[PDB]
Amino acid sequence: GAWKLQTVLEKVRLSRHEISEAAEVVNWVVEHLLRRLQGGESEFKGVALLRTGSAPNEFDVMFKLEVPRIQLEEYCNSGAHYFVKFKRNPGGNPLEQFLEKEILSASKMLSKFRKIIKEEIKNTGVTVERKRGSPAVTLLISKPKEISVDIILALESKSSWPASTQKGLPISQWLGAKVKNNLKRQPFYLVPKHAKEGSGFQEETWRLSFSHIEKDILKNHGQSKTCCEIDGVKCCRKECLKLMKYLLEQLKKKFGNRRELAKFCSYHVKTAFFHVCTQDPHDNQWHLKNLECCFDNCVAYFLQCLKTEQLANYFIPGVNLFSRDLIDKPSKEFLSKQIEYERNNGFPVFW
Ligand SMILES: [Zn+2]
DSSP: OTTOHHHHHHHHHTTHHHHHHHHHHHHHHHHHHHHHHHHSOSTTTTEEEEOOOOOTTEEEEEEEEEOTTOEEEESTTOSSEEEEEOOOOSSOOTTGGGEETTEEOHHHHHHHHHHHHHHHOOOOOEEEOSOOOOSOEEEEEOSSSOEEEEEEEEEEEOSOOOGGGTTOOOOTTTTOHHHHHHHHTSOEEEEOOOOSSOOTTGGGOEEEEOHHHHHHHHHTOOSSTTTTSTTSOOBOHHHHHHHHHHHHHHHHHHTTTSSTTTTOOHHHHHHHHHHHHHHSOSGGGSBGGGHHHHHHHHHHHHHHHHHHTOOBOSSOTTOBTTOTTTSOHHHHHHHHHHHHHHHHTTOGGGO
8 A cells, every 4th residue: 555556546636527527518519520421521531439448637539430452562571561452343432532543641541531621610719720640630629618629540350450550469378269269350440650751652551459459458457257247246457457547647748848758659658558467368367456566566567568668569569668669768768767766666647
């Protein structure tokens, strides 16, 4: 009880109320816009909502677009980025006007996407800011409350997951082979996300997105089916993830005046957390009463990731989120030093 983590969890929860009401607002706007696209005659007719995914004035949502016969070409042997292409369909491809020869232009598609949402924003109390660099068409909600909502276009493919994901999702000892097999039968998504710097080639690439698998695993996170249910026993997995996210955000805000923490995000700790679930697959390794030791274990694993510059994408093992290509050594050293300090002093940044 020395770290008083339950009190920290209460602090984090208290905040859940305001964002709960912003939902009504986002729900209202977004669902309308969807109806609009679906009823119009644009290439985004087949658009639908994806429920996947703190700071209460900022949300993002994903509009998926089924597209069949998707073929993927790996971009520069990177397991995450891909060119999307199509062979000739005798019928029309609704995205045919975005192709240059066989391959899909993310830029021309996003440009068009942004264009027609702008035309459909016609009442109001809501606008869309000029392009942040980000793929998202971001909405600015004036009233009732002030809300930023980023709309992320995604392609949905119902084909088998790409080869790069072959050794990914190492959950066989934890959630089991049947769950793993069923998750991998689910569709995957492609999102036009590329680095700020980058060639025009990169700007036309798409990266794999498994946010829906992540959500499923977090919500169904126990080896026992009764984990955290009333007729079961409570684990601390979700509490550890929340605390890890909270530690990073409190640190990013404490040191927002320097560059070293700018490239770290919640996805890094979530990724590290999933690896810890794989190392410790049994519910009895996560008893709620041992919250402190479990949190400490997650923190130590994350420190080992920083030091060794190794944090493999959970779904795409060939992708190292902590490679020196992506985050320089001094940045990881800085975060390492702060996390060691926090850990040695019972996490003062929580208070
Ligand atoms: Zn549980």
